[PDB]
Amino acid sequence: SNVESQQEELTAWLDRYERELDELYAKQMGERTYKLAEKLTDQLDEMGKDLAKMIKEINDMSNTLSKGSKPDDPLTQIVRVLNGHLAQLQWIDTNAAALQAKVAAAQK
Amino acid sequence: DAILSRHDLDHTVRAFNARRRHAELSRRCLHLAARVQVLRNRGYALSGDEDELKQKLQQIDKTLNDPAQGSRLEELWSRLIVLRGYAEDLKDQINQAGITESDGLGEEIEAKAKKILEDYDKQLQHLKKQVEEAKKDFEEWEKQ
Amino acid sequence: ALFDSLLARNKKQAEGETALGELPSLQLGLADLRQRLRKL
Amino acid sequence: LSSDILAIDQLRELVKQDADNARLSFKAIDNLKLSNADLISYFSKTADEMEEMMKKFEKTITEIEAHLTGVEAHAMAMQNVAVDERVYELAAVLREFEESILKVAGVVGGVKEGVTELQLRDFM
Amino acid sequence: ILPMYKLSP
Amino acid sequence: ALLAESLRLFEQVAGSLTPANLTTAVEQYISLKYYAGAIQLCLTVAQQKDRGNTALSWVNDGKPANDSRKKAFDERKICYNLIHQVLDKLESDFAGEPELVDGRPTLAATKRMEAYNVVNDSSDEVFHFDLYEWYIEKGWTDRILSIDSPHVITYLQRLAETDFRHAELLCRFYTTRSRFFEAAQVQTNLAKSDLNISLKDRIILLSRAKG
Amino acid sequence: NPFPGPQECMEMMFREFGTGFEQSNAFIQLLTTLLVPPEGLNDSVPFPEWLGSSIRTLGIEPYVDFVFDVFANRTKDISDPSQLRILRLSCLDFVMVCLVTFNEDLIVLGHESNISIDDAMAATNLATYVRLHPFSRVMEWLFNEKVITSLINTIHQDPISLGSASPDSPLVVSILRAIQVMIKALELQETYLHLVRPEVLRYQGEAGVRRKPVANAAYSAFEDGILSHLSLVVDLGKYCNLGHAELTLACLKLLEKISTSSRILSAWSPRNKAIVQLERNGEGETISASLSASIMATLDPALAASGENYRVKLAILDFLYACLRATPDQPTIAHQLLGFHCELSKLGIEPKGPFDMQKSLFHSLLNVLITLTVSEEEQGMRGYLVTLKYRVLRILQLLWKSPLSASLVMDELRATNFLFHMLLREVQIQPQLPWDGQLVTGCEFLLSDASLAYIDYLASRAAIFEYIGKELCSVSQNRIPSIKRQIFDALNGQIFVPLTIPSIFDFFDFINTDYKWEEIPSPHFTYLKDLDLGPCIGVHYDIRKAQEILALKRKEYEHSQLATPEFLETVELEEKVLIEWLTVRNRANLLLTARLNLLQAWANLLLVMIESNDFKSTPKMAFLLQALQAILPTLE
Incomplete structure (x- = not known):
């Protein structure tokens, strides 16, 4: 609710700035590079989204291909949870290895 | 039940919704933070560290706007x-073994596997937190 | 309801979204997964 | 719930930096109505951040390639072929996960003890 | 439980 | 104090001395028996004409003919040829003279050791290569062997690969130092080579390698 | 100037040709046909380099831009489903024809050696090729959300339609083309992001080009846009029960590539989402049942390498291998498909489930393996059977080594007497039995493909010996003589159900120095003798590293102008001999390492047998003396 109202004050104010912005425009009336920077930063979001869609579809095809007469079954369940565990275990391993590496620095 | 229903x-919906609202407001924030660096800083004297910025921007922009890199995705999609x-066809062809599949899967070992999985999850969580602590506790020594 | 929450979490996990980094990860399983585990 | 904690924790630090970045922009306009060297770091920061997000995209792409190349084989065997045998797989997996966890555990313990070593050498 | 796995050639 | 301060003055404008002046300087240094010093000036003038070390990237790639880096090597060599010029009058002036009265070394023998320390210790290995190439042309064989620098090993190894009579020295280099295996290692690998070597020589090589 | 500026008239005409479906499809087909070179389906991109140089246009980009905009936006104004399917198929074919006409190895070798080794003359050619070829624009469009959304909408269809549809239905062809485009994109995304984006950005910064971005910066890779779709894997798995060989293989390859990625599995398992998505209405059970019914289908002896069933089987096996090898510690979808209850960092079996009743994918694999005979008469020691059993044994080893799925697997194996079936399926090897009608002593054996089958058989024997040793050690540490008696009887050469079998000493026929795998006949090689294998070399001597050197040497000799025409055939035959020399050396190294692994496994098995043996020694003295006699010549 705090995080939810922080997205109310910091929105109404963001809307409030637009007046001083239009005022600044009013002052100036009497760039493209940034506009390229924003679209450039924004364009990859669409790529992330599309990539996500792809991955989802790949998952759909693999899951449906391997099994498609009982999508509410406990196999894909074990598969998924077990994948989760694999990923988490990988994270643990890698980060632990990183910390282990970090100790060698203190071995001076 | 009450806690879980909540x-x-x-809560999930408000979390997701709030995250998307953050993203949107981040975009707006950068947009404003961008226009500020336009209208006020339109005194033609915009240089210095700008070169480095547009250098980075040009590098990443050049890396993105490539035929091959852009083509790989398109090729991948059709691929x-x-x-x-092929899979849908081969699936429709072998769309007969349903009872063997459902009954073959439904078993008893699954229950035990679930248990072993939960145990693994607990052990994994413990290890994860232990490493987390090992990190947090080391970055202290990093200062001293 | 534990394993259920593990599924649910690992379900919501591999499904989006716009979080500036965390895209859904593809699931493997069994054959590829064992080798993927051994390659740890 | 414990999983729900980390969600808010992320959402907390997110709105807080968005609060500041949206605040740094207004103070510049409020200064004008009556910091240009500061936002440069912010833009270059967004750039530096995205610069890796692109690498992530490359990584995931390469993975997707490497994965679908496997999907092809799986289907290529599945077409070629055209319950109890796979039950052994599950066991073979779990008995191997036990080992992998037990492997990682050693690394973790080694790290932790390795840190406490320095911790000790500090006040010792 | 073992209908065909028996070693009965 | 005059020659040491002259040397300070020359090294400052090293990246800008004309070959005509650098010569007149070395010519005078030899008249005053200032051998080791004059060598150090020419070596310094070399590095300051080519700081990026293009004569290295030129020779390391191996004889890129029709190249702009020819300037680097040619200018560096004008200084190197003067170093060779000094080392000649060094032996001439102290020709056949002994390195000691009983107990005490001569000052002639001192100016000798001072000179050959500047040469053997330098980090310019393009200079060392041009120096080793010039030692052979004078028949100073036993000189190359005594050098303990590791730039001589690279020169002799890179030359043994296409010249039988240079692989000969590398084998002699190892055997005076008593690295007997390393010599037989080359003698054997040389008899098995694709090089134009007579069979009766390969019999000697393998017979020395066996020993 | 269709009778108003050109930039406006062109877009007006394009929009006019966009209304409807007939004219749009006809224009798409015309463009696809025009994009084909005259030599047929590598340089000389199929279009003039001066296309649009007069007017300020980017060349042929407007066409692809309009095609993508149409396919992304105007796909909702088509009511007739057939017209929409035909349009999507035409667009996919256009995208494939545009992508397949892109050079990958050429651009790689260019960016590698052109500017760094070669001169700067040809650099302009590669630059113009990369700048004018539409591959970059296609890749940029692939990162859009509209494209992936349309793709997953086209692939997401009801099963009744595909079931009642004909094999030549446009829906199946469109799905196949879409899967192929996705595969090509996943393959070429790295090459693009590496050697296209930076060059295009540098060119746009240097020169003056006005282009509109159509990519999302947030989507750093193609997986980011597809990881938000969970029904994709479900649909791919359900499409395996259709029977279409091509579609099944494509779906299997796609699922394998997805499981092989890293970001997808990091997002899924940061609880999990795939395990719960595949356990909604029993999808995993039906998928496993369909896979079992498929692998159980027999094959055509005549169409060994052409039997679609064998291809589907090999694809499924490769998918399982890739899914198990990647992240073995953490479970995956393979464990669920095998019939295990995938739980968080834990597995288990459910009562009355498919795996408990011995009716699942793993049990089906065990059955098809124990009911497989390789010993043939007309040819003898077939190759594809050997490959199938080798893949099965690799999957079994990957499942066993994983401690998370080891105890239950060993229990299920010892509860069905798997070692006994394996031993009964064993066959003795001798220098007389040929491999696929070809003898081993023949020189062409090292050049033929029989070396792969031989290595596979050696690895199979090694794995079987290792499993037997592990089971013997387990039974010994369990201090139960109920099974030790049967184990010894099987080792003694008798079976009490008496059926006899060759003892372990009989299988010690793979150590033979008569073939002289170490010795190699060195030809004269009067020329190219100085060309060594330095840059060629994990003993793996690359052939291109020597091919480039010998090509440079031939070019230098030709430039020398000294009897270049006559002595060319000598260099050609020397190269044709050197390539086979390298292949033979690689095959010999592979055979040597395989023999080493097999000998190590046999020694470990013999040690475990001798150490854990409570039986009397005076009766086993005969086997001891036999082993001594057998090793005497080996040591000598």
């Missing part, structure tokens, strides 16, 4: 659709 529905059609 979480599984009332996926091939397997989509």
